[PDB]
Design a protein around this ligand. Structure first.
Ligand SMILES: N[C@@H](C(=O)N1CCC[C@H]1C(=O)NCc1cc(Cl)ccc1Cl)C(c1ccccc1)c1ccccc1
Lengths: 11, 276
């Protein structure tokens, strides 16, 4: 149930 | 500047239980943490699927301290690398992207203690993570002090309470926000007689005796987080242990075992100065 972190970090 | 919390020490405010800790120097059954009460707390987060791996601590702007077993535990086919993970510093809520409060960092290099014993008893369960770029400190983000021989010596004594924090299991529901518990250190005898695992000098155990009436412990998800103590001499928080292993969470007659950070400080120095 984690809230979507910014894609900027996931990149 | 380590171990003096922007929102408490620096303003002369006491958090609601630190006096239990100071009065003793003569997460299961913990409570919700106050904002800014452990600004060195880090969440290790897996990118896919998105999930809480472990706790950890901020020891400088570039370096995070965690339990080696969070990264490499071959029994469970766990072997993570730099790009598998994200470090999230400044958090309170387990699941929310706390926009404008937290910072997410990418890892540059993971270092596991070369004699980490995953095969038998998680002896030297300690790993260092160098972040890609420095985290800037804030009210919610501040490092903890690693101990020196003399602070280790006078504080890590049976009966002296320490404080453990983490977003792991509440029972053997995970919490909404960071939980905290204050546990007494236990005599090595008692520690050895409660288990079948060979205990080594790089470890100590904490928890209340079944007759002490209070209770509390770390549990699954809490691994890698800090066991910290406040010095009654200079008022700073030092990290004495890393949450390593237990036999269930808060069983009577059982105790949690922590990596003894002072006993492995030489390896920590050696890695920091030789690599940044
Ligand atoms: N329950 C295992 C554990 O805590 N483990 C297995 C490896 C990861 C770690 C853990 O989840 N620690 C989180 C934890 C820490 C503490 Cl301080 C208290 C409760 C809990 Cl669950 C542990 C164990 C001890 C005795 C009998 C079976 C298993 C064990 C000790 C030594 C070597 C292997 C296993």
């Amino acid at each position: 149930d984690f809230e979507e972190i910014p894609e900027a970090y996931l990149a | 500047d380590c171990g003096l919390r922007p929102l408490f020490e620096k303003k002369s405010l006491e958090d609601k239980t630190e006096r239990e800790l100071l009065e003793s120097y003569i997460i299961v059954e913990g409570s919700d943490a106050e904002i800014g009460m452990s600004p060195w707390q880090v969440m290790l987060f897996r990118k896919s699927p998105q999930e809480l791996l472990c706790g950890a601590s901020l020891i400088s702007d570039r370096w995070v301290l965690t339990a080696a077993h969070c990264l490499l535990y071959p029994p469970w086919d766990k072997n993570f690398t730099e790009n598998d993970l994200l470090v999230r510093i400044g958090k309170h809520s387990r699941t929310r992207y706390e926009r404008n409060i937290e910072k997410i960092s990418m890892l540059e290099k993971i270092y596991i203690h070369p004699r980490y014993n995953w095969r038998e008893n998680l002896d030297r369960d300690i790993a260092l993570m160098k972040l890609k770029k420095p985290v800037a400190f804030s009210d919610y983000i501040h490092p903890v002090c690693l101990p020196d021989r003399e602070t280790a010596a006078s504080l890590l004594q049976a009966g002296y309470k320490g404080r453990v924090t983490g977003w792991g299991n509440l029972k053997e529901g995970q919490p909404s926000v960071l939980q905290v518990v204050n546990l007494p250190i236990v005599e090595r005898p008692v520690c050895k007689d409660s288990t079948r695992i060979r205990i080594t000098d790089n470890m100590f155990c904490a928890g209340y005796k079944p007759d002490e009436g209070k209770r509390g412990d770390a549990c699954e998800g809490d691994s890698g987080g800090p066991f910290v103590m406040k010095s009654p001499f200079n008022n700073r928080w030092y990290q004495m242990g890393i949450v390593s292993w237990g036999e269930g969470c808060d069983r009577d007659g059982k105790y949690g075992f922590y990596t003894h950070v002072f006993r492995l400080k030489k390896w920590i120095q050696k890695v920091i100065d030789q690599f940044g």
